[PDB]
């Protein structure tokens, strides 16, 4: 019901006797867990949020200068000084001016001039940063079974369960009802890195702008802008936004460089977005490794008789889904209402073999509704039977395309999530562990070399390494350079 | 003026919405195209210079691309 | 006198028989003319201005979006339409989104979505440009004879005259009083190019910014910002300041890129400034070529008797000016006020030889003024006599230093002016004509090639050219490319 | 996504005040220095590779300078 | 007689036909001028001073800290700030301390701590600098004819006349009374370098230190001490006298480096001293080049009659002075007190040829006194006849020794004064010009290379160059190195 | 630690009295001798080391002087 809404969807199969499933949940994706002899469930991560986090720094994006004072002195006379050079929130500059008899100085030469102004920041032009606390960052994980009834995204499901995960949670039991219980027993250390995550926001929100941005600590702590802290009163580095023109006799024009919001936005391309509603600071790009326990799950509808075959009718006719599946919903015209649906399919001309891999394992029609059936069929011209209700079906695609798409999904998960991609659907093995170690080492090398380098320079460096290896006289150096260049090119695309 | 380094760290990305994904490359392409369109005799002269003074295809291509890339940016 | 108020100054010396002097009056410099038998005069360019010029396109630097609307259709239902498209000041975008039964669409697939929003410009966020007219632009030239009186820049001089040169003026004859007439003939066509000049101004009052800038028409007209005319109300290219985010089912976000004034200021580095006053649009950088006629000038106080030797006191003892000259003032209390000052100078140990190059024609004490003296001395120890007054003077420098300074000033004039610098102090010689022609051709070629190229790329191109010259086997190409590279390097540094 | 090329035309310059003379050069220098400080390991690797593989000092210096000046801006 | 009061004396013999003499008068020196038929005079430079000279930047040698204040914040609670960080006359420091639970924080890590303290300067501890003015610095030259009466150094001489020289003085004529008139013309520019000289005061009288020092502007302006100007109120670089200890949790210790008068005094070894009385700032080392005129001198007492023989008596018998001269003093006891002393000397064995070269030309007795005589006899056995008196004199030495001493004095004058020594007693010529130009070139090069290098490193470099010349067998390089090394070795000794 | 460079200029010394004339040389000699009297074994080691390792007499002497002059002022 839920996974059909989101395009990014993964299927997990749990063979009979399986005790636990390991997942890497991620925002913007759904996971359907199909198990032998147990109901299928949808598990997804709804949001990551903290309430009332601490702030870090307040960069000023637009300044207003109030009062300007200029002091000049004659060449032979000493340097020019102001009381304002040693006051809080003042921006000053020292330079030299050409003096003479025209400027009423006794000698011709270069004088001393100092110009000062009062720095003040516009209230709505200010970039505020917030940081997350490991003990308080909360992960909300939702689980809904396959109840056999369809509800749109704007209709609430009474069988949906929510679990909020802080570091104080070991194992969460969700009473799915007649479908048993499901455990989650998963970790918060595998999520985002709070020590290197900053959620920047702008005070002005009605300017048609995102609420917040998901930044990195190093970039946010190295901006060439004035800064302070909320409880503090005196600004730091006030001369960034102010430029002083060349002196003219006894004058020095002070110029304001305008608003730097546009430059900041132009330099933020590619960063993930975030949200703020009231005091909750959400983020919309993240993941968390979570295990699912299928021990206590229970199949509803095994003691029931079988729905009559000659009493079905279409409510929605089957259609292609967004995930290579068939979705439908039937209606039943009988009084023996709580019963089981006889679904089956056959390729045209092979009527003795069923080819339907039901995702709703045991469909039921109940007094309160039911009838939503989702299946996956092999390519070709099939026939979908629900009792006496036939529906000729032609499934698109091919086996080779399916294998290629599965490989592409694996590669994309590897590119997005990273080393945790080896923890997805892992039942415990040696290949996964060695792959994870190799990927960790490779990622460490790649991040320590080209971590803060752009896409084009990385591609050019890879090509330069490839050329050096190709022209390399010594075979060993040639092989080393070709391998490193190919590795850099492969990692660069991700 | 004010120099704000581009956010080159992509360690936080996910499946959520991103702020102007890939407009740095479009900005670079627009800058190079504009500079080429305003400077045509210069680019033709560079092309003819590399063509008749170099013997290796890679050398010609590298010289041309580096000139075109370093011209507009360091103006 | 007036030339002494500026650090930049030029001396034009005329031998007997010279009656016309060709000058390149730069706005920001002063010229002192020192002939024989005639008074010295100061000629400089005051300002270049026009009242009420014509308009050009006006851009928007910060927009204001409102009345956002979205319309979406299901995957097969057809394309989406909005009346707000095909309307003025409305920025729109068309895209496709993922639909399905979760969004109440009958089919899974990509559906058409369209978003629009109204466009407005903030009241004081504009970059308006203006264009001068060759027939209406005005040049102001002022003349001040050397009457022996000194006045600071704050005090007005009653001996000063002004002349305005439009194309209808051409030739203006001034009456300097008892010093005769001075003829000026400035050709306006030799000034700036009005066609290629735009005086851009931001409408944002205060904000601690320059009044206006002096731009080039191509750069201003090739900008990627919305534009329109003053009289018009509808903007063009309204989508330059706006961005659309990725669709989310049945809604897409419209973003405001912010105020681009800071980027514009960042891209205007090195551009000359200007002014607007109330309605007169001035320029602070420029030049004009004038011819000065020295035939009708008279010398005041030639038949005056000589002042008494023992009645001279130092009002201002000699001091070193910024132009390797000496400036002093005296007082006289010996009655018979209209008389001639007996000023001179001799090097120590050589009392039989005078080494004074008076800049004032013949210092004279009148009934109600006189006393100021300006003069130039050779390096070494000197003695300055004004009657019986004595004052030891040590002038620093050397003959070679002065020659180097003169050639340095000539090179600066070439770098700042161009081919008109060959008309400075000209006497119509063939050398000047050939130099002017060669400079015209070389500068034309250099600007055709490297017109819009920056300093660093020009230097790299010159280095590459010299490398090609050195490495090239053929002697014919080696000399050509090495000489061209040397020319490029010398012209780029200047 | 608004790119405004710098005013490289200098026919109109004279002896008056100019707007932030030499600011772009300082911006470029600061950008290069900031990039180098954050990628010291990569810079050392580039220098060492140029020393190892290139046998001419002039080519070595040209390659190093090209890499350093072409990295940060295209990030 | 004044030349007899010090060990540094020079003799100038103006042969017949000499009207003017060029001298280099130094502080601590005396010049005796002798002519064929004119009185001898003593010309010396007495003082160099200026009244109320300008005041340059001061320096603080000993500070006075107080109002110590410290602020600390927890590791993840933001930086610590004080209002005193942005105030005047405060020394502040930022560092990180180690926090925990015994520091009553919440997390273990690196905190932020800041310490500030008010900076004051002790009343008596400053280094005040002064700069001379070329138009107000005075050179005091005194002249004293050989009257014939001896006054000790602590007795006023009525016949001594003074001339104070400034830039306004051209040719000062001094009235010596019955001995005629003497003209003087001194070049101030040949004296001290005002622009590159500083007079530094320090301490109080009770500290038992020199009144002032004669420093170099470059050294004075580059000191690493707090500084300001008298009219200022806030010190500059107050962190140079304060050291901050390592942090300890919530504490930082601020220490006073102490009094820097001892370091400054130890750094000033070798510089000359000065003097300061009331508001005058004298100098004790210096010189100035003057030109003396002898044409108006007269010889007194030529019309008197000779004294009696048998009426004389020794008052001070001849004693060998410190400058190869013989000084006597007699007492005539006759009524005709105004008369002429018949002085005469003959070498033993030739009683018919006089040998005395009287420096006191025409000794005369007078009512007030008279009787002092100074001779310069040839080496050997002599006899001094004064009337009927006799006194055997053996003048130690020889002509070769005297020529060697003259050469030694010339070399010492080169060492001390320098290039100006070639103008001493010079009528012009070519040797005094070629040698002066060569010395100017050598001094310029030597100052440009080893201006601020010490005696030991200069000797080391000279030895290194000599050895390089000896080893390297190339003719040109060997000769260059040997010559330059020899020049360095000779020039570095003074 | 306030370090005040010594006044090494000799452009103003004449015939008048001076402040602590020829005291830097005396201090240098005293410092060197004092260091050499507290490091007898190290000084002997350096002397014998230059004795044995070198045959050029001037090399021996210059090495000894350089070592004994670089010891105290930098330790
Ligand atoms: C115990 C193993 C049971 C089968 C199994 O584990 O493999 C079955 C498939 O069996 C076969 O194709 C066997 C073919 C021979 C008939 C289910 O695995 P799956 O394809 O859903 O695994 C997901 C991971 N892939 C896509 C990389 C495999
Ligand atoms: C196929 C080429 C496109 C996908 C691609 O090249 O994806 C590859 C997938 O890994 C591989 O090739 C093999 C990796 C196994 C070791 C690169 O992405 P990654 O996940 O290794 O790098 C992203 C994750 N870091 C940056 C943290 C390392
Ligand atoms: C360095 C001084 C020589 C170059 C110079 O003085 O600048 C050269 C003149 O050189 C010559 O050809 C001199 C030829 C005779 C010698 C260009 O003068 P321009 O007015 O065209 O350059 C100013 C305008 N730009 C900067 C836009 C190009
Ligand atoms: C004891 C020192 C004696 C002077 C001395 O050894 O003077 C020698 C030169 O003597 C000669 O070769 C005289 C040769 C004449 C024939 C070195 O110093 P300097 O006199 O060139 O003065 C150098 C110091 N400046 C630059 C301040 C004056
Ligand atoms: C989730 O969103 C869906 C879709 O938006 C929403 O279903 C909507 O319910 C409303 C409820 O009124 C429907 O509005 C209809 O609009 C027109 C108005 O003319 C008519 O179809 C309906 O009015 C008539 O309805 C009766 C029979 O239906 C008539 O007999 C009578 O004359 C009424 O006037 C009605 O107003 C709207 O069409 C649907 N949209 C669909 C089905 O796509 C659903 O409720 C939302 N779920 C929530 C909020 O939990
Ligand atoms: C210059 O100083 C000298 C001393 O250095 C002064 O002369 C000496 O002064 C002392 C007194 O301090 C004399 O003592 C008395 O002097 C006179 C005789 O001269 C007489 O009153 C006493 O019998 C007694 O001796 C001393 O004699 C005298 N002589 C000497 C050789 O020292 C001198 O006065 C000083 N000059 C000036 C102008 O101050």
Angle formed by the axes of helices B57-73 and B23-38, to 10°? Answer: 100
Is A407 within a domain?
no
Q: Which residue has the tokens 């919001």?
A: A261
Measured CA to CA, the distance from residue E256 to residue C329 in angstroms comes to: 54
- Structure tokens belonging to residue C375: 């003069």
C358 with C463, same domain: the answer is: no
Measured CA to CA, the distance from residue C31 to residue C144 in angstroms comes to: 11
Cα angle at E359 between E356 and E360, to 5 degrees?
Answer: 105
Full domain range(s) for residue A29: 9-52+131-194+280-292
Is A212 within a domain?
no
Q: Using CA of residue E91, residue E95, residue E101, residue E107, what is the dihedral sign?
A: positive
Residue E458 CA: which ligand is closest?
4
Where a domain ends, among E300, E330, E353?
E300
Q: Which residue has the tokens 């410190």?
A: E322
Provide Rg for chain C, Cα atoms. Answer: 33
Within 10 angstroms of residue F8's Cβ, the number of other Cβ atoms is 17
Distance (Å) of CA D7 to CA C148, C267, C424: 46, 6, 30
Full domain range(s) for residue F68: 40-75
Q: Where are the beta strands (DSSP E) in C312-388?
A: 312-320, 326-332, 339-340, 343-347, 357-358, 364-365, 373-376, 380-386
E315 with E276, same domain: the answer is: no
Query: Rounded to the nearest whole angstrom, what is the distance from the C-alpha of residue C418 to the centroid of ligand 3?
Result: 6
DSSP lists the bridge partners of residue C11 as C32
Query: Rounded to the nearest whole angstrom, what is the distance from the C-alpha of residue E432 to the centroid of ligand 4?
Result: 15
Is F52 within a domain?
yes
Is F21 within a domain?
no
Is D45 within a domain?
yes
Closest partner residue to A87 (CB to CB) among E78, E86, E231 is: E86
Q: What is the largest CA-CA distance in chain E?
A: 116
C252 with C357, same domain: the answer is: no
Number of domains observed in the structure of chain E: 3
Closest CA to D25 of A260, B72, A246, C269: C269
Distance (Å) of CA E315 to CA E319, E321, E365, E372: 12, 16, 13, 9
Minimal-distance CA residue of chain C relative to A68: C208
Q: Using CA of residue E471, residue E475, residue E478, residue E479, what is the dihedral sign?
A: positive
Distance of CA A426 to the CA centre of its chain: 23
E71 with E192, same domain: the answer is: no
φ, ψ for residue C424, nearest 5 deg: -80, 125
Is F12 within a domain?
no
Give F7's contacts (C-beta < 8 A, 6+ positions apart). Answer: E215, E216, E219, E267, E268, E269, E270, E271
C457 with C321, same domain: the answer is: no
Give E407's contacts (C-beta < 8 A, 6+ positions apart). Answer: none
At C24, which CATH number? 2.60.98.10
Closest CA to A213 of A272, A260, A269: A272
CB E45 within 8 A of CB E287: yes
Is F58 within a domain?
yes
CB contact under 8 A, B70 and D74: no
Distance (Å) of CA E130 to CA C395, E276, F14: 24, 11, 20
Query: Rounded to the nearest whole angstrom, what is the distance from the C-alpha of residue E311 to the centroid of ligand 6?
Result: 28
Closest CA to A257 of A243, A246, A267: A243
- Structure tokens belonging to residue A182: 């499901």
Give the three-state DSSP class for E356: coil
Is C272 within a domain?
no
Is E252 within a domain?
yes
CB contact under 8 A, A86 and E85: no
Angle formed by the axes of helices C430-450 and B41-53, to 10°? Answer: 80
At A333, which CATH number? 2.60.40.350
Test site for ligand 3: of C272, C434, C439, most ligand atoms within 8 A of the Cβ:
C439
Output the ligand 3 site: residues, CB below 6 A. Answer: C 411, 414-415, 417-418, 435, 439, 442-443, 490-491, 493-494; D 10-11
Neighboring chain C residues of B16 at a CB cutoff of 8 Å: none
Q: How far is E259 from chain C (nearest CA, A)?
A: 42
Is F69 within a domain?
yes
E319 with E370, same domain: the answer is: yes
Q: How far is D40 from chain B (nearest CA, A)?
A: 16
A485 with A358, same domain: the answer is: no
At C83, which CATH number? 3.30.387.10
Closest partner residue to B2 (CB to CB) among A215, A241, A284 is: A241
Residues counted in chain E: 494
Tell me how the structure was determined: cryo-EM
Whether chain B has a CB inside 8 Å of the CB on C265: the answer is yes
Within 10 angstroms of residue C194's Cβ, the number of other Cβ atoms is 18
Angle formed by the axes of helices A475-493 and A455-470, to 10°? Answer: 160
CB contact under 8 A, B14 and A456: no
Is D49 within a domain?
yes
A94 with A147, same domain: the answer is: no
C103 with C212, same domain: the answer is: yes
CB A250 within 8 A of CB A113: yes
Measured CA to CA, the distance from residue E494 to residue E413 in angstroms comes to: 10
DSSP E168-210: T-S-EEEE-GGGBEEEEEEESTTS--STT-EEEEES-GGG---
For atom 19 of ligand 3, the residue with the nearest CA is: C418
Q: Which helix (H) or strand (E) holds A12?
A: strand A9-14
φ, ψ for residue E71, nearest 5 deg: -135, 135
Number of domains observed in the structure of chain D: 1
Is A89 within a domain?
yes
Closest partner residue to B5 (CB to CB) among D20, D34, D66 is: D34
Distance of CA A218 to the CA centre of its chain: 19
Neighboring chain C residues of A106 at a CB cutoff of 8 Å: 319
For atom 35 of ligand 6, the residue with the nearest CA is: E154
Is B17 within a domain?
no
Whether chain D has a CB inside 8 Å of the CB on A470: the answer is no
Neighboring chain A residues of C153 at a CB cutoff of 8 Å: 102-103, 249
């Amino acid at each position: 019901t839920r996974c059909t809404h989101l395009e990014n969807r993964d299927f997990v199969t749990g063979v009979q006797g399986t005790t636990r499933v390991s997942l890497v949940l991620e925002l913007g994706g759904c996971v359907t867990i199909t198990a032998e002899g147990k109901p299928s469930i949808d598990v997804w991560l709804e949001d990551i949020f903290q309430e009332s986090p601490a702030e870090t720094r307040e960069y000023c994006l637009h300044a207003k200068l109030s009062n300007t004072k200029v002091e000049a002195r004659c060449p032979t006379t000493g340097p020019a000084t102001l009381p304002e050079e040693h006051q809080a929130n003042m921006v000053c500059k020292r330079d030299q001016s050409d003096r003479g008899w025209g400027n009423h100085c006794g000698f011709f030469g270069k004088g001393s001039i100092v110009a000062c102004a009062k720095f003040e920041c516009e209230e709505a032009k200010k970039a505020v940063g917030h940081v997350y606390d490991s003990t308080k960052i909360t992960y909300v994980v939702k689980v809904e079974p396959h109840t056999g009834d369809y509800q749109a995204a704007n209709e609430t499901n009474e069988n949906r369960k929510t679990a909020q995960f802080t570091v104080a949670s070991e194992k969460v039991i969700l009473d799915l009802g007649d479908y048993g219980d499901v455990s989650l027993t998963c970790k918060v250390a595998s999520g985002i890195d709070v020590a290197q995550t900053v959620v920047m926001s702008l005070g002005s929100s009605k300017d048609h702008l995102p609420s917040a941005w998901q930044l990195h600590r190093d970039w946010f702590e190295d901006l060439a802008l004035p800064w302070k802290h909320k409880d503090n009163q005196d600004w730091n580095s006030v001369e960034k936004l102010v430029e002083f023109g060349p002196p003219h006799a006894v004058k020095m024009d002070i110029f304001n460089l305008g608003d730097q919001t546009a430059v900041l936005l132009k330099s933020l391309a590619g960063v993930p977005l975030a949200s703020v509603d009231n005091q909750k600071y959400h983020l919309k790009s993240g993941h968390v490794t979570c295990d699912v326990g299928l021990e206590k799950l229970k199949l509803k509808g095994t003691t029931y008789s079988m729905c009559d075959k000659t009493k079905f009718k279409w409510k929605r006719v089957p259609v292609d889904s967004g995930h290579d599946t068939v979705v439908m919903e039937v209606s039943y015209t009988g009084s023996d209402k709580p019963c089981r649906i006889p679904v089956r399919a056959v390729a045209h001309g092979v009527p003795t073999i069923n080819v339907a891999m039901l995702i709703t394992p045991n469909p039921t029609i109940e007094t309160s509704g039911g009838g939503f059936i989702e299946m996956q069929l092999p390519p070709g011209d099939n026939i979908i039977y629900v009792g006496d209700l036939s529906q000729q079906w032609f499934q698109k695609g091919s086996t080779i395309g399916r294998m290629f798409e599965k490989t592409r999904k694996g590669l994309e998960r590897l590119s997005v999530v990273g080393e945790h991609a080896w923890d997805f659907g892992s039942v415990g093995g040696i290949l996964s562990s060695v792959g994870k170690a190799i990927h960790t080492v490779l990622g460490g090398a790649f991040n320590t070399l080209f971590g803060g380098v752009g896409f084009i320079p990385k591609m050019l460096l890879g090509v330069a390494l490839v050329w050096l290896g190709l022209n390399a006289r010594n075979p060993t150096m040639s092989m080393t350079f070709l391998a490193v260049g190919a590795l850099t090119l492969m990692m660069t695309m991700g | 003026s004010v120099v704000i380094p581009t956010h080159a760290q992509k360690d936080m990305v996910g499946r959520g919405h991103a702020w102007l994904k890939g407009d740095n490359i479009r900005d670079h392409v627009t800058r190079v195209e504009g500079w080429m369109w305003k400077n045509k005799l210069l680019t033709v002269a560079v092309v003819a210079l590399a063509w008749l003074m170099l013997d290796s295809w890679m050398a010609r291509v590298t010289v041309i691309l580096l000139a075109l890339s370093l011209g507009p940016v360091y103006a």
